[PDB]
């Protein structure tokens, strides 16, 4: 059984994009050491990302600069993974008829999202939920 709805955004795959946070304007960043955060510096080399669809509505989110996969670990922390594993799949969904959200597939029952705070730090999975501004993204082509 699905734990979530199936409203999908138009897909934007195999082309470099930025994940823009509607909660403060940071872009999602995967640094070379595997840590994840946000920055408003549009020229940063580590905010360029590429999404690919695994199944309909399931994506990987990959750093174009470093090849790392975004992933969420067992305690809810985002990290950069050298190889694709079960922690790297996200359910890409439309939200409020406009934004994109990314739910951890591994933890989908628990409603753990990719989230960016106004101060540029990312949220731990269990501190996210439907209704939060931190979970809302726009995918901007580069």
From Swiss-Prot:
Q: Where is this region: Heparin-binding?
A: 117-133
Indicate where this protein is primarily found.
secreted
Effect seen on changing residue 123 to E: Loss of CSNK2A-, CSNK2B- and LRRC59-binding. Reduced integrin-binding. Defective in integrin-, heparin- and FGFR1-binding, and defective in inducing FGF1 signaling, cell proliferation and cell migration
Changes after translation: In the nucleus, phosphorylated by PKC/PRKCD.
Give me the residues that bind heparin, please: 23
What tissues harbor this protein?
Answer: Predominantly expressed in kidney and brain. Detected at much lower levels in heart and skeletal muscle.
Q: Which BP terms in the Gene Ontology apply to this protein?
A: activation of protein kinase B activity; anatomical structure morphogenesis; angiogenesis; branch elongation involved in ureteric bud branching; cellular response to heat; epithelial cell proliferation; fibroblast growth factor receptor signaling pathway; lung development
**Disulphide bond pairs:** none
Top-rank taxon, per record: Eukaryota
Q: Which Pfam families match?
A: FGF (PF00167)
Query: From the record, which residues define motif Nuclear localization signal?
Result: 14-17
Q: What is the effect of changing residue 121 to A?
A: Decrease in LRRC59-binding
- Identify the InterPro entries for this entry: Fibroblast_GF_fam (IPR002209), IL1/FGF (IPR008996)
A cellular component term from Gene Ontology for this protein is: nucleoplasm
Task: Name the keywords, alphabetized.
Answer: Acetylation, Angiogenesis, Cytoplasm, Developmental protein, Differentiation, Growth factor, Heparin-binding, Mitogen, Nucleus, Phosphoprotein, Secreted
Q: Where in the cell is it found?
A: Secreted; Cytoplasm; Cytoplasm, Cell cortex; Cytoplasm, Cytosol
Q: How does it assemble?
A: Monomer. Homodimer. Interacts with FGFR1, FGFR2, FGFR3 and FGFR4. Affinity between fibroblast growth factors (FGFs) and their receptors is increased by heparan sulfate glycosaminoglycans that function as coreceptors. Found in a complex with FGFBP1, FGF1 and FGF2. Interacts with FGFBP1. Part of a Cu(2+)-dependent multiprotein aggregate containing FGF1, S100A13 and SYT1. Interacts with SYT1. Interacts with S100A13. Interacts with LRRC59. Interacts with CSNKA, CSNKB and FIBP. While binding with LRRC59, CSNKA and FIBP seem mutually exclusive, CSNKB and FIBP may cooperatively interact with FGF1.
The family classification in the record reads: Belongs to the heparin-binding growth factors family.
Q: What does this protein do?
A: Plays an important role in the regulation of cell survival, cell division, angiogenesis, cell differentiation and cell migration. Functions as a potent mitogen in vitro. Acts as a ligand for FGFR1 and integrins. Binds to FGFR1 in the presence of heparin leading to FGFR1 dimerization and activation via sequential autophosphorylation on tyrosine residues which act as docking sites for interacting proteins, leading to the activation of several signaling cascades. Binds to integrin ITGAV:ITGB3.
Q: What is this protein called?
A: Fibroblast growth factor 1
Tell me the classification of the organism that encodes this protein: Eukaryota, Metazoa, Chordata, Craniata, Vertebrata
Q: Which gene encodes it?
A: FGF1
């Amino acid at each position: 059984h699905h734990h979530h709805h199936f409203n999908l955004p138009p897909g934007n795959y195999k082309k470099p994009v930025l994940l823009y946070s509607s909660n403060g304007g940071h872009f999602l960043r995967i640094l070379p050491d595997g840590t994840v955060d946000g920055t408003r510096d549009r020229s940063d080399q580590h905010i360029q990302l590429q999404l690919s669809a695994e199944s309909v509505g399931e994506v990987y989110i990959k750093s174009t600069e470093t090849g790392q996969y975004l992933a969420m670990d067992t305690d809810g922390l985002l990290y950069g993974s050298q190889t694709p594993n079960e922690e790297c799949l996200f359910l890409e969904r439309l939200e409020e008829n406009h934004y994109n959200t990314y739910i951890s597939k591994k933890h989908a029952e628990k409603n753990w999202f990719v989230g960016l705070k106004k101060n540029g730090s990312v949220k731990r999975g269990p501190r996210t939920h439907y209704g939060q501004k931190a979970i809302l993204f726009l995918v901007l082509p580069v």
